[PDB]
Paper text:
Anaphylatoxin signalling through the G-protein coupled receptors (GPCRs) C3aR and C5aR leads to various cellular responses including chemotaxis, oxidative burst, the release of pro-inflammatory molecules and activation of the adaptive immune system. As for C3a, C5a activity is regulated by carboxypeptidases that cleave off the C-terminal arginine residue, producing the C5a-desArg molecule which has a distinct bioactivity pattern and generally a much lower potency than C5a, in part owing to its tenfold to 100-fold decrease in C5aR binding affinity.
Both murine proteins fold into a four-helix bundle motif as observed for hC5a. The mC5a model was then used to solve the structure of mC5a-desArg. In both structures, the atomic model was traced between residues Asn679 and Ser746, which corresponds to the four-helix bundle core, with helix H1 extending between Asn679 and Tyr694, helix H2 formed by residues Ser697–Arg708, helix H3 encompassing residues Thr714–Val722 and helix H4 comprising residues Gly725–Ser746. The overall fold is also stabilized by three disulfide bridges in both mC5a and mC5a-desArg: Cys702–Cys728 (H2–H4), Cys703–Cys735 (H2–H4) and Cys715–Cys736 (H3–H4). Surprisingly, mC5a-desArg could activate mC5aR to the same level as mC5a, although with a much increased EC50 of 5.35 ± 3.94 nM. Thus, in contrast to the activity ofC5a-desArg towards hC5aR, mC5a-desArg seems to act as a full agonist of mC5aR but with a lower potency.
Author numbering: 677 to 745
Amino acid sequence: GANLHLLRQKIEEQAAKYKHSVPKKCCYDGARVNFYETCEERVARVTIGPLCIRAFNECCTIANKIRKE
């Protein structure tokens, strides 16, 4: 199915753009598969902080786009 190799390396590239651990983890969390909600739906649930929200949304978007194709 989806290129999971590419998936992991693209997410790691994105998490590396963040300075601190928590936004990195928000990235990895956003990148996890969710069959029932879009990335906007999912990130709308998160209120930890602006940088966490941004990383979550960015990595979700990256992950789902890779899955889509």
